[PDB]
Design a protein around this ligand. Structure first.
Ligand code: ATP
Ligand code: MG
Ligand code: MG
Lengths: 147, 985
């Protein structure tokens, strides 16, 4: 557990994630605060989103708990920060690194999946009135994800 | 009329129909020694109609080797007469009687007949009758480290269930015109060739919805075939298939017929030539007893061994057995003829009791027909086993001294064991230790810890407890009961009410763990198992792990410096459903049950906690405004539960329950259908509500409906409990109050700055001040499955069934809801007995200090199919460090409490390794990539001071060591794993 977490941390340190920066909170290895940069080709451009990662005691045999801290207007992310990611609930295997999870979350931010949504109202707006969805996403990422 | 408060865990293994048929069956048990009493105890706990005992032989001292209902004051009294009184207390629904004499015709009164300690001629006489009258016959025998079971249920036995597995079911994607049924994406049906299935909810092929079973031809892990469906239709879309299980007919042979041509069951495939040997050996034992006035061969006697081998030769010649007799094994059977071990008795009694249950219930696949077993690998080799050491001494351990000798008895009597847990396996282990004489010497001791209390459902498989003990601590009751069984354990047992975990290291510390000889786990969760495994690895103590699940069970042994630990293996994790599936799109009853549990927690537990914390913590609002993920939710909960919706009577509670019904079963569904209409399509043009997504429909409140009324009653009662009001159950008040209810209008909303903080502040200041409410608290609802008067399971069942009605899912009953929501683990007494027997058979290997890894056996078994298997433990992995052989698990570094710089220099100069990471507990003490200033501040500090500074907590006075995890790189930069560090404070 500890050795695997430190190996992942060192791998992150050796090769910068460029679009991400994860590190332990204080000195606790089972609680990380990661940062994600909004993709340029997305409504969340120019945004900084903070995520909290809680490694379970049985890591890597149980999925880490990843929750958004910054408010985001996304069909697959609810108000509590829960992320509708398959690799975090039942598809988790002891072979996925935190860099892969952050890349998956960035890809999710790149293009949402409204056909299996977590927030039905945002998904409905996305499917029906695309322009209003874009405006709402830009407003949210300007109000919350900046400063 | 089954008492589900007592048979709760057993009904999840057997079922209601099986137990109903079981409670109408009579069992006769001939022989009341250790094996007989074990079988009778298991049968009485199971719940058969009644049990009759027949054993007119007077009690003797050696009989106490495995008979725990006999005391030394009963010497000279018939065993059955002294055992019936103690057996009658185990279960109040199962009368226990005694018969002085047996006649053949009398056997017609019983559903099953079990025979032990009876000669072969009498067994033939009994079986010749029981076979032709269709009476189940079981014959069991235990000789030293050898055992035999024989089952004969008649020529036309009907077995409804052959494996004990739930019927397979699944969701279909498409069925072609040739019957090729395909599962949904990445879904495995699990069927096998020759199975029968029935389809329902099939679109395009209504003919398959009749329910007629159809053959299965598996074509792959995702598809199968059912034959030709040409006439019914061309193609079928979606639908659910369910397996159909058909009865089987099993034909048994009589004992007389099967003596000549037996049919063996092999408990192990490494020794497949032995059962033919034991078949001759046991018959030779019977012949020898007949030729010597019923006296078995004396322990470790060569003359008797030679005579027994001559009998074996004669029997083999007579039966035309074309098998070469193994003299060593046969003479070993001769030597241990008078042995009587409690572990073998427990193992065989569990197996035989399961066979009796199979006979009575016509369930699971029975043994067919001879089952010969041996644990000869347990015989000590580090002590002297001869005729002089194994001769009886006129004590209660004669049956065991006849197998192991007096020196091994002295070794056992000075054990210092530690038993974690006092559940069913704990009680069985304590009984076995008491019978074996463990820790009855001057230097012996037993320690048992358990923080739980005795409940009604625990009495069904924990025989050391009685109804008068409900509500008391398990460890104290178990210690008292075992001290009653073996008076020599008076003062040799210590009982703790401490949970084994990080918070109890002040009690189970270095001093406590340094005096032990072995640790035995009797736990039910993986966290405590892993913790105890880590502690044993650190202190280098043998560990005995054992677990059960329904009729399945396993036992593992961990030996220092020899095998791997318990945590070196991985088991399947628990399945948690996606949040989106639970929130909006459920398709199985489990999803609705999980949603109902979440609703219960969010309605009756969390808002109460928020209200209580607001009235206690002076600075709760400010902390919540910037700490919690939804301060507005917390403020709304506080307001609603304090001022806005505070009930003044139970009528207001009923109105609130009606409002919540509308909120959760009528309005959210309308909103969901407004967002995603039933005619909506996905981005690819396919219909949205297709496949795993079922279109819901809002519910209209009908008071006459049963589910609606149940939900209203449960919700109102729980709300009243939260506010401490007087609840009621008469339907008249509910019907009167709910008649005058006007539903508020609701229309789905289409949607379409910093003032929000101002609104939050306005809400906050609208709340009453904490000073105005002193001494006022709201009672939260803590989930409790085992109580049927708190409306918890009732509420969960009602909510789950209502949500199933929303999505057209088949509702479940309160039984299945309690099974799913409570995470109840099915349990049986027979499985507990079997695992206790196996663990105690490995314990003697541990005591003897066996070194080779081939002499130990990890065991697995499944009693529903009669499967037993044993495999050698996995050796601990080795590694190369600095050109030396290091054990990955059982090696460590021992260092003083030096400074961090000194530790790094030691690792550089001794091991030639560069330290890159050093951590202790859950804190990162040192990392190679930290800024130089931080390291320069931390380098000259001692390890203990560094840990205290980083963890912000002083070390406890009882702390005597530190366990450090270190990651280091070699000279070339290649990462090399190293064992942990043991800093001595
Ligand atoms: N960490 C622990 N430390 C000490 N004892 C423990 C620990 N975890 C579990 N136990 C005890 O282990 C025993 C497990 O036995 P068992 O599971 O049969 O009982 P139960 O959990 O009370 O019953 P049931 O699961 O049938 O409702 C219980 O006495 C439980 O108190
Ligand atoms: Mg309990
Ligand atoms: Mg339990």
């Amino acid at each position: 557990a500890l050795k695997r977490i430190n190996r992942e941390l060192a791998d992150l340190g050796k090769d910068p994630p460029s679009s991400s920066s994860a590190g332990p909170v204080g000195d606790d290895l089972f609680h990380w605060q990661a940062t994600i940069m909004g993709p340029a080709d997305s409504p969340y451009a120019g945004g900084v989103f903070f995520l909290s990662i809680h490694f379970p005691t049985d890591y890597p045999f149980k999925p880490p708990k990843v929750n958004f801290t910054t408010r985001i207007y996304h069909p697959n992310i609810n108000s509590n920060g829960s992320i509708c990611l398959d690799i975090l609930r039942d598809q988790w295997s002891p072979a996925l690194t935190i860099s892969k999870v952050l890349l998956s979350i960035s890809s999710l931010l790149t293009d949402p999946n409204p056909d299996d949504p977590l927030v039905p109202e945002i998904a409905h707006v996305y499917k029906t009135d695309r322009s209003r969805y874009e405006l709402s996403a830009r407003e949210w990422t300007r109000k919350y994800a900046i400063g | 009329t089954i008492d589900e408060g007592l048979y709760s865990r057993q009904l999840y293994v057997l079922g209601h129909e099986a137990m109903k048929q079981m409670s109408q069956s009579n069992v006769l048990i001939i022989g009341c020694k250790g094996l007989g009493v074990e079988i009778a105890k298991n049968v009485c706990l199971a719940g058969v109609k009644s049990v009759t005992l027949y054993d007119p032989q007077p009690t003797r001292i050696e009989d106490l080797s495995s008979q725990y209902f006999l005391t030394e004051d009963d010497i000279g009294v018939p065993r059955a007469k002294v055992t019936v009184s103690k057996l009658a207390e185990l279960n109040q629904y199962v009368p226990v009687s005694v018969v002085d004499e047996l006649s053949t015709e009398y056997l017609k009164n019983f559903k099953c007949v079990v025979v032990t300690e009876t000669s072969l001629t009498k067994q033939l006489e009994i079986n010749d009758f029981t076979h032709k009258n269709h009476i189940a016959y079981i014959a069991a025998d235990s000789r030293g480290l050898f055992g035999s079971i024989f089952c004969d249920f008649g020529e036309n036995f009907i077995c409804t269930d052959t494996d004990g597995n739930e019927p397979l079911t699944g969701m279909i994607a498409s069925i072609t015109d040739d019957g090729v049924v395909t599962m949904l994406e990445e879904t495995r049906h699990g069927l096998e060739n020759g199975d029968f299935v029935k389809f329902t909810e099939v679109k395009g092929m209504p003919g398959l919805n009749d329910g007629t079973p159809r053959k299965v031809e598996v074509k792959g892990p995702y598809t199968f075939s059912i034959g030709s469906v040409k006439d019914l239709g061309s193609a079928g879309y979606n639908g659910v298939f369910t397996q159909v299980k058909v009865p089987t007919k099993i034909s048994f042979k009589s004992l007389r017929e099967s003596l000549k041509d037996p049919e063996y069951v092999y408990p192990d495939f490494g020794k497949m030539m032995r059962p033919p040997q034991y078949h001759i050996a046991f018959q030779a034992l019977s012949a020898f007893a007949d030729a010597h006035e019923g006296s078995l061969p004396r322990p470790r006697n060569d003359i008797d061994a030679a005579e027994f081998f001559e009998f074996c030769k004669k029997i083999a010649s007579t039966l035309q057995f074309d098998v070469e007799l193994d003299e060593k094994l046969i003479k070993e059977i001769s030597y241990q003829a008078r042995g009587d071990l409690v572990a073998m008795s427990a193992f065989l009694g569990g197996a035989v009791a399961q066979e009796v249950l199979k006979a009575t219930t016509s369930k699971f696949y029975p043994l067919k027909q001879y089952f010969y077993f041996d644990s000869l690998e347990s015989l000590p080799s580090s002590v002297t086993i001869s005729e002089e050491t194994c001769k009886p001494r006129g004590c209660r351990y004669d049956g065991q001294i006849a197998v192991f000798g007096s020196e091994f008895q002295e070794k056992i009597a000075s054990l210092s064991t530690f038993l974690v847990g006092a559940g069913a396996i704990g009680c069985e282990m304590l009984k076995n230790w008491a019978m074996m004489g463990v820790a009855t010497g001057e230097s012996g001791h037993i320690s048992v810890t358990d923080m739980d209390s005795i409940e009604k459902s625990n009495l069904n498989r924990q025989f050391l407890f009685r109804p008068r003990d409900v509500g008391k601590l398990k460890s104290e009751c178990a210690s008292t009961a075992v001290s009653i069984m073996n008076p020599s354990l008076t003062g040799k047992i210590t009982s703790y009410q401490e949970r084994v975990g990080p918070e109890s290291e002040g009690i189970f510390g270095d001093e406590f763990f340094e005096k032990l000889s072995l640790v035995t786990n009797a736990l039910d969760n993986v966290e405590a198992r892993m913790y105890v495994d880590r502690r044993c690895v650190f202190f280098e103590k043998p560990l005995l792990e054992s677990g059960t699940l329904g009729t399945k069970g396993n036992t593992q042994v961990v030996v220092p410096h020899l095998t791997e630990s318990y945590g070196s293996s991985q088991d399947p994790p628990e399945k948690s459903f996606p949040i989106c599936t639970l929130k909006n799109f459920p398709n199985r009853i489990e999803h609705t049950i999980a949603w109902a549990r979440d609703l219960f927690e969010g309605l009756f537990k969390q808002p109460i906690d928020n209200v209580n914390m607001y009235l206690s913590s002076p600075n709760f609002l400010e902390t919540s405004l910037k700490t919690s993920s939804n301060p507005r939710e917390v403020l709304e909960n506080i307001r609603d539960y304090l001022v806005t919706e505070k009930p003044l009577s139970f009528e207001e509670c009923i109105m609130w329950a009606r409002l919540q019904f509308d909120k959760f079963f009528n309005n959210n569904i309308q909103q969901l259908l407004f967002n995603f209409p039933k005619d909506s399509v996905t981005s690819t043009g396919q219909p949205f509500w297709s496949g795993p997504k079922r279109a819901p429909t809002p519910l209209s409140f009908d008071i006459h409906n049963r589910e609606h009324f149940d939900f209203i009653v449960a919700a109102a009662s729980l709300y009243a409990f939260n506010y401490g009001l007087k609840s009621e159950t008469d339907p008249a008040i509910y019907e009167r109050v709910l008649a005058g209810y006007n539903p508020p209008p609701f229309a789905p909303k289409s949607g379409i700055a910093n003032k929000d903080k101002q609104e939050l502040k306005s809400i906050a200041d609208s709340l009453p001040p904490p000073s105005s409410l002193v001494g006022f608290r709201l009672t939260p609802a803590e989930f409790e499955k085992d109580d049927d008067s708190n409306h918890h399971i009732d509420f969960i069942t009602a909510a789950s069934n209502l949500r199933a009605m929303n999505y057209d899912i088949t509702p479940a009953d309160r039984f299945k809801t309690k099974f799913v929501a409570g995470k109840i683990v099915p349990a049986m007494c027979t499985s507990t007995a079997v695992v206790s027997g196996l663990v105690c058979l490995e314990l003697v290997k541990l005591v003897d200090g066996k070194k080779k890894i081939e002499e130990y056996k990890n065991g697995f078994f499944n009693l529903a199919i009669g499967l037993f298997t044993f495999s050698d433990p996995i050796a601990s992995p080795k590694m190369k460090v600095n050109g030396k052989e290091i054990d990955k698990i059982w090696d460590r570094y021992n260092l003083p409490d030096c400074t961090l710089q000194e530790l790094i220099d030691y690792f550089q100069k001794e091991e030639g390794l560069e330290v890159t990471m050093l951590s202790s507990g859950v804190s990162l003490l040192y990392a190679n990539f930290q800024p130089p200033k931080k390291l320069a501040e931390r380098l000259p500090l001692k390890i203990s001071e560094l840990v205290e500074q980083i963890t912000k907590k002083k070390l406890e006075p009882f702390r005597k060591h530190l366990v450090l995890e270190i990651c280091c790189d070699d000279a070339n930069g290649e990462d090399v794993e190293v064992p942990f560090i043991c800093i001595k404070l």
